[PDB]
Amino acid sequence: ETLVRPKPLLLKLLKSVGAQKDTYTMKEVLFYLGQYIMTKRLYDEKQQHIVYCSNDLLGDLFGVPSFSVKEHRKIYTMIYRNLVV
């Protein structure tokens, strides 16, 4: 499908959740990236679409304190800035 290669920070985030590799389809990236968030309970408990990452590598990565998963163009863009291919 869309085979991407994650940048250094993102690859580290990925390994953190078991993804042991250098090349991924867009789907694997999102899957693990979602597993990281769910696992480290980084979402707001009441408004689950709010994710907090100020205190997190995810924030270093996306370069923002928090974000709304409901803003597809934003999420997709931030994620793309960290990929190649």
């Binding site: 869309t2 867009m26 789907k27 979602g34 968030i37 689950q48 679409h49 597809h72 997709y76």
Partner: peptide
């Protein structure tokens, strides 16, 4: 609306 529901609606490619 839970996180997992929301997150799966992201562009998969």
């Amino acid at each position: 609306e839970t996180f997992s529901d929301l997150w799966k609606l992201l562009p998969e490619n």
